Amino acid sequence: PLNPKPFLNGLTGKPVMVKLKWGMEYKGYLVSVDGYMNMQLANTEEYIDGALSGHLGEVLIRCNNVLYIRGV
């Protein structure tokens, strides 16, 4: 058992591919995602269907888009 808090905390900073509800897969090191599940990564690149395409980096997503989050 590795709950949301410990798992998303050991992956908060681990470069995560995070799939949003429209194909957006962020590739980058999360800053913090607290109980509000508000995501925010540092030096994360955009992906559509897993294709790295964008350079905005430290971007802060609302959890309402989040489909999945994994530490690559």
Binding site: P1, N3, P4, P6, M17, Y68, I69, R70, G71
Partner: protein, 81 residues
């Protein structure tokens, strides 16, 4: 009369088994999440392990590892292993 078997009881027994199941999604019944859950909380925001997206029409599987899918985009699961 009869007592309640919580969905959290289901998820807890599944996690204790460390079992592999495929899970349903929202507004797209084509794709299924094939993987195992590692832990849980009081919120039922499903955390997963060695998961992969499996498409019905396309017939592909894209793996994530220890992924953290959304909690509201869960519907149910079938324990495949």
């Amino acid at each position: 009369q009869k007592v309640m078997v919580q969905p959290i009881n289901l998820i807890f027994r599944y996690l204790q088994n460390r079992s592999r199941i495929q899970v349903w999604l929202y507004e797209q019944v084509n794709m299924r999440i094939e993987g195992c859950i590692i832990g849980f909380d009081e919120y039922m925001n499903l955390v997963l392990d060695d998961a992969e997206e499996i498409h019905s029409k396309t017939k592909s599987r894209k793996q994530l590892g220890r992924i953290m899918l959304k909690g509201d985009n869960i519907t149910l699961l079938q324990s495949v292993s």
